[PDB]
Amino acid sequence: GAMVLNCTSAQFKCADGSSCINSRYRCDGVYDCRDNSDEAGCPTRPPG
Ligand SMILES: [Ca+2]
Secondary structure (H helix, E strand, O other): OOOOOOOOOOOEEOOOOOOEEOHHHOOOOOOOOOOOHHHHOOOOOOOO
């Protein structure tokens, strides 16, 4: 919990909680979290 950021229930909190990003920034290609938990907890190579 290194500098826990405050977000809503809709927004995605990082694994450590150090940052919050949008739910629209879950699964896009880039890494928005402190590590990469935003795309780690995401479908592994989406079919289509
Ligand atoms: Ca992302």
